Amino acid sequence: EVLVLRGTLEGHNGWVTSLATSAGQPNLLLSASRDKTLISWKLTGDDQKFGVPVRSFKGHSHIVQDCTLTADGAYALSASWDKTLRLWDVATGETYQRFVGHKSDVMSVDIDKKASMIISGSRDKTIKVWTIKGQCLATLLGHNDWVSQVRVVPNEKADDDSVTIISAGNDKMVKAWNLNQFQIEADFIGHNSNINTLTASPDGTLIASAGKDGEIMLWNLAAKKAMYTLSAQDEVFSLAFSPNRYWLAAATATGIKVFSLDPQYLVDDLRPEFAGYSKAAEPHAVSLAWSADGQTLFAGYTDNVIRVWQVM
């Protein structure tokens, strides 16, 4: 098992800020970009031009910061810097519900496992939870600087109706929230820099958080205690665990350092070739995503193309 660059997707004009896929269609990929649009892709397997765009979602006035997809892949939600959220139909465009009530940039969105309620972290230091019809159930406070990314933990154990969320902002302190009675539970102290991202494992018991310091820092949320802190040695943007292996991928400013965690070694240090751009900087990935089966690793870079990486 080793990674190789198979192909690249080109549909955008701004930084591909987020990727998302859905387990129901392994030929699906939803990519959000800085040109305030979303593109859905038909993953055709070919030597060149692997994957083709088919649907564009336009309708956000300023930068769309991320996207999440429903499990079946019928609906998409996109969070944008125009203080709105838009729920879209991948088939017909034609947005159903527009969520307003955040007063600043919304940064991350995540739909429920049962697709019932919708969490939203914004730059107005609040975490608003919404219906499918669009009403903000709660406003979750105590959070000094602004929220930078939120996600939901995966229920893997049978008969856990419970849903708890994870939040990371630039106050160097990440939190856990039980949304059935709207409490705060955990205060994972320990970061020294602006936390850019956080990821829950499909185990639902691990959380890796990572920021400006370069410490991809690992926490066991099953016991509520720190596990260890990894080191990527420069600034990092996104993390994602593989759905099958015991693996973690990380978007450093140099490249994608991807980590196995059981013998604790980085495996490849993949760095693609760019044919230009050499003086200033090479463009760097700002958003990565695994497949459902974990076969393909997707990466959107700052040169508005999307590079893929295949296992062997």
Partner: protein, 55 residues
């Protein structure tokens, strides 16, 4: 404001210009256009030990 005082030699004009303080305004702009103030960040010590508070 401008006034004409009528003396016995001729008219004496009186101009008065008053610059009010922008801070005491309470209605509209509180500062001049190019006044920029950066707020001083409150400085705290690095933690160097990872911990979880619980509930």
């Amino acid at each position: 404001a401008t006034r004409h005082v009528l003396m016995r030699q001729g008219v004496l004009g009186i101009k008065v210009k008053i610059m009010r303080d922008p801070a005491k305004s309470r209605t509209g702009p509180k500062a001049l256009p190019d006044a920029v103030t950066i707020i001083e960040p409150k400085e705290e010590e690095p933690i160097l030990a990872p911990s979880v508070k619980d509930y």
